[PDB]
Symmetry: C3
Subunit: 221 residues, 3 copies
């Protein structure tokens, strides 16, 4: 069942990537770079999850799905780039702020991987450093990044705020599920966590980019 | 014999790097970036293959020898070669970094699938191999499609040089997955010594040979 | 004691990063990118050294202890330090990204050769070590040659600050391969405790110390 769910995920990612490629052929004032990012995220995630379906992307008394971290270390920084470029649409780019988000995010994912390989109190030291990184990412998202969005007009700002809330709501679920599942307190069962880390990413990757790109395309008129 | 062939490769890479450095001192209208790229490719490849010569860049996976150092080489050297190809098409014009990074993304994925296929057993090997081949096909479509159209927009002489280097690169690159499939990593129709010879000779033409042809053509446009 | 020293290092790195963040709030003509670089270096180094304190960032190879977390640190922290040095030379002028990325390429190779040398036995160790030393020599040639000529093209005051920072960096960097060769990874003339102390004290001056001198000088040009 776990294998079949991962095949299904990969096929959905493929369909998402094809959809974004089609959208790219009629870009409606959205730079090609934003279509490329929207395509890379699902294709990379699909390949990582395919490795799990084939029984390669995990090792074992606890089962570590290490392929998830290989996925996120590429997919999550690209999602923050998409969010940052949304705020800066039609205005000057602030690449320093964008790369600050990339740095925080990559660190966040690495701490998660190390926490998963750690035992006892050490696990929760690494987990905590990752949570602090997420908090700073959210402060940037709703603070300085949102102020850039406002400087680019009411229509863009409203779209940015919608996508920022969408992303923020989904992202807080990952460390919550992690802590409750076998990697943390073990209150939730493996099958439950597997289902969460199938459903969340579909909304986080394909769903986010549909909402993000449709909003920006609508600003063309 | 396998060790000595790898030492020989590394020394040739060093000589290639030195030649490109010399060319860089009298650049003839070619930006510094393109000389830097031409130098990094052979120096990185040389260091990787040196690790094989010293018996470090390989391990035994059951009954087969995996030359993992080749993948460490290619994951850096192949995206830089595609960058050189892309910058050739864009010589005299605006850079399209989105198209360049699309090629880099496809290429890195291609090399990774190759490494995973080599570590895989049975049908799973050929799933990963197939994803890599599809990535190569898309790279070739970009090379002879949109990238070639950019070359045309930069004039007849540049376009003619681009088309020549693109064909040279394309011809050599299709040989890699062919050799891979026929050798011990695939169907095992070819012996280890045969595969080793191919993955010594191909890279010499793919790395040093390609950059000689590429840089000489661009330098000639200056005159 | 080895664990306690690494905790202390990590706390100092955190304080360094906070100081640079504060400086960034009142930038005095120094672009945000240079404050970001100064913050990432100590934060990344702090995290790597924390892994050593917790007994995770090391393993026992042959009959020696490899502190592999040092290489994870340096492969990110050292290229960012060279970027900071390159941007100092180019302050008030056109950026030369080709020269900057040449330094990054040399540096990453240098750190990788060091890691492979540490994992190597006999003659092979000194082949990898030597390739790394040659990389450092070329970095120093760039620092005092073409990079210094760019600094001169940006005026006397900038050039004087650049020269001071370049000497500061160069003096500290030559100590690393020297300590490496003398310690358990090399000839084993120096004891583990001695090497641990050197690779605690050097990085404090190399990371936090360097950025204080570098940023204060550039701020003073305002
Ligand atoms: C912590 C893991 C590794 C993360 C490394 C990330 C490196 C961060 C540094 C990037 C420098 C950003 C340069 C921005 C240039 C343009 C500046 C601007 O105009 O705003
Ligand atoms: C498989 C792993 C992939 C990792 C790398 C992915 C890179 C994706 C990022 C895209 C950056 C696009 C740069 C856009 C520059 C705009 C200017 C121009 O087009 O010339
Ligand atoms: C040893 C690992 C190597 C990895 C790093 C690869 C570096 C090669 C890339 C070169 C990019 C060239 C910089 C772009 C030129 C912009 C113009 C300029 O200001 O000079
Ligand atoms: C491409 C995306 C990343 C996929 C990588 C993860 C799996 C690679 C490891 C393969 C090991 C197969 C042998 C085994 O462990 O049974
Ligand atoms: C729990 C989640 C914590 C953070 C939520 C956002 C924090 C405040 C937003 C930034 C404030 C601002 O700088 O304007
Ligand atoms: C949405 C909320 C989902 C709640 C799931 C709780 C059951 C999981 C478990 O304990 O196994
Ligand atoms: C720069 C070159 C990068 C490639 C080099 C890889 C070398 C890896 C060494 C691994 C340890 C070998 C152990 C042994 O000698 O038995
Ligand atoms: C694995 C990563 C693959 C991503 C490559 C996607 C190819 C996109 C081709 C069109 C590029 C564009 O939109 O300009
Ligand atoms: C799309 C094009 C893909 C081309 C790739 C071909 C791989 C064919 C599979 C290799 C032979 C299988 C032999 C076997 O099953 O034992
Ligand atoms: C910067 C943050 C990353 C630092 C790297 C440290 C890797 C730690 C991994 C160790 C896993 C447990 C080892 C063990 O105790 O067996
Ligand atoms: C493998 C690890 C590699 C890590 C490399 C980290 C990145 C290195 C250098 C990037 C710095 C470039 C700074 C450009 C600033 C331009 C500007 O501010 O005008
Ligand atoms: C250490 C050696 C420094 C040598 C400095 C050379 C300056 C002249 C140059 O090479 O351009
Ligand atoms: C300054 C010199 C510092 C080194 C002298 C002490 C060496 C101690 C040792 O070899 O264990
Ligand atoms: C039904 C399985 C679908 C696999 C699609 C290929 C993998 C995702 C894209 C890479
Ligand atoms: C598996 C990796 C490749 C997946 C491709 C998805 C669809 C993208 C098509 C792009 C075609 C570009 C031609 C110019
Ligand atoms: C253990 C083998 C893993 C191979 C894939 C590595 C991909 C790294 C991407 C970051
Ligand atoms: C292991 C770290 C990999 C990080 C992925 C790279 C993400 C950088 C994307 C930045 C795109 C900026 C676009 C500018 C226009
Ligand atoms: C792993 C280390 C990451 C360090 C990133 C620090 C982020 C600093 C905040 C960004 C600048 C905000 C400007 C207001
Ligand atoms: C680590 C140093 C703290 C950085 C926090 C920055 C948060 C962003 C502030 C915006 C006003
Ligand atoms: C992996 C090795 C990378 C080699 C980089 C070569 C740098 C040489 C730069 C020459 C000086 C330019 C002025
Ligand atoms: C995970 C391994 C990733 C390796 C990436 C290697 C670097 C490829 C991109 C560099 C080429 C960019 C050239 C830009 C030209 C601008 C002038
Ligand atoms: C056994 C593995 C075979 C690998 C073959 C790789 C593909 C060869 C080239 C065929 C497709 C060329 C596409 C050109 C399109 C131009 C537009
Ligand atoms: C032993 C057989 C050696 C075959 C060598 C083929 C190399 C092809 C290079 C083409 C130029
Ligand atoms: C026996 C140990 C010998 C050590 C060799 C180290 C030599 C110094 C570095 C290489 C410099 C190259 C000129
Ligand atoms: C004026 C030309 C450059 C002279 C460089 C002198 C050598 C500096 C060595 C510093 C490292 C200790
Ligand atoms: C057996 C002794 C070998 C000679 C050692 C030479 C002295 C130390 C060499 C390393 C110094 C690194 C800094 C180079 C710049």
């Amino acid at each position: 069942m776990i294998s079949i769910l991962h095949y299904g995920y990969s096929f959905i990612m493929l369909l998402g990537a094809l959809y974004f490629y089609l959208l790219s052929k009629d870009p409606k004032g959205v730079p090609a770079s934003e279509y490329l990012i929207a395509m890379v995220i699902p294709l990379w995630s699909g390949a990582a999850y395919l490795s799990i379906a084939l029984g390669q992307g995990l090792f074992q008394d606890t089962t570590i799905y290490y392929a998830r971290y290989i996925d996120w270390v590429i997919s999550t920084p690209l999602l923050l780039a998409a969010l940052a470029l949304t705020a800066m649409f039609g205005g000057k780019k602030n690449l320093t702020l964008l790369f600050s988000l990339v740095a925080l995010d990559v660190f966040m994912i690495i701490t998660g991987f190390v926490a998963d390989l750690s035992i006892g109190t050490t696990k929760y030291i690494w987990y905590s450093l990752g949570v602090i990184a997420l908090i700073i990412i959210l402060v940037i998202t709703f603070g300085p990044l949102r102020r850039i969005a406002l400087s680019n007009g009411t229509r863009l700002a409203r779209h940015y705020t919608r996508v920022a809330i969408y992303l923020s709501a989904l992202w807080v679920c990952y460390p919550t599920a992690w802590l409750l599942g076998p990697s943390g307190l073990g209150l939730a069962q493996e099958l439950t966590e597997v289902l969460v880390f199938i459903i969340l990413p579909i909304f986080s990757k394909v769903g986010f980019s549909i909402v993000d790109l449709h909003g920006l395309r609508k600003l063309h008129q």
